[PDB]
Amino acid sequence: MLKAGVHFGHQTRYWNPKMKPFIFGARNKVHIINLEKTVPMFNEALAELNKIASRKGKILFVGTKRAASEAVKDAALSCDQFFVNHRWLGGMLTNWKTVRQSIKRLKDLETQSQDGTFDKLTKKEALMRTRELEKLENSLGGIKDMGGLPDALFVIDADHEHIAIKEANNLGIPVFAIVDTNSDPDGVDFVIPGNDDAIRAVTLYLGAVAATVREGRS
């Protein structure tokens, strides 16, 4: 609601001109992201989300960039939802029948270190699994508590995650995306312009969307 106004952003000199109805100017030859047009459409998706969160839509939060990575585990895994904090395995959504097998293998891998293969055989064939465990748990995390394909995707960088969108675009899943000055508005039908790569900015987004998920189920 323009309460803070802490994400002017601008992301660069260049841009994708598709956000011309979303910009202004600044003295550094760079494009001021609109906050007046942002406000109405922003709360539209939150209202939309509450209409879908009341039917247990399994919201998915996608934050991959290093700075905003951790706060995604503080919003999705916080309440009940799922995150992809590190790199997006190409095809994780449309090639679900193969990621499904690897999640099931992980569930054995974690318990292959609880009560199985940690001490009762050679460390060259027992400890090395934990090296595959650590490679997995951050490359494939909170989605381990899924039961199939989700219904609402939430992404932060509409360009850095331009290939996650396409799989969602391939299926029917609507997505909320926080687009930027350099971003692309098309593809994602629920546009939320604004600066992304700032911790003081991401907290405004994630901290004020997870609340709507909370109020959906109660």
Is residue 21 at the binding interface for RNA, with CB under 7 A as the rule? no
In terms of CB distance, is 13 or 107 closer to RNA? 13
> Cβ 104 to RNA, closest distance in Å?
39
Judged by CB under 7 A, the residue of 13, 100, 107, 217 near RNA is: 13
Judged by CB under 7 A, the residue of 5, 17, 148, 172 near RNA is: 17
> Cβ 189 to RNA, closest distance in Å?
18
Is residue 148 at the binding interface for RNA, with CB under 7 A as the rule? no
Is residue 187 at the binding interface for RNA, with CB under 7 A as the rule? no
Is residue 29 at the binding interface for RNA, with CB under 7 A as the rule? yes
Is residue 200 at the binding interface for RNA, with CB under 7 A as the rule? no
Instruction: Write the secondary structure of the chain as one string of H (helix), E (strand) and C (coil).
Output: CCCCCCCCCCCCCCCCHHHHHHEEECCCCCEEECCCCHHHHHHHHHHHHHHHHCCCCCEEEECCCCCCHHHHHCCHHHHCCEECCCCCCCCCCCCHHHHHHHHHHHHHHHHHHHHHCCCCCCHHHHHHHHHHHHHHHHHCCHHHHCCCCCCEEEECCCCCCHHHHHHHHHCCCCEEECCCCCCCCCCCCEECCCCCCCHHHHHHHHHCCHHHHHHHCC
Judged by CB under 7 A, the residue of 14, 163, 200, 207 near RNA is: 14
**For RNA, which stretch binds (CB under 7 A), given 13-21, 135-143, 150-158, 209-217?**
13-21
**Could you tell me how far CA 199 lies from the centroid of its own chain?**
15
In terms of CB distance, is 165 or 206 closer to RNA? 165
**For RNA, which stretch binds (CB under 7 A), given 17-25, 97-105, 134-142, 169-177?**
17-25
Among candidates 99, 75, 103, 73, which has minimal Cα distance to 85?
Answer: 73
Is residue 162 at the binding interface for RNA, with CB under 7 A as the rule? no
The residue ranges that bind RNA (CB under 7 A) are: 13-15, 17-18, 20, 29
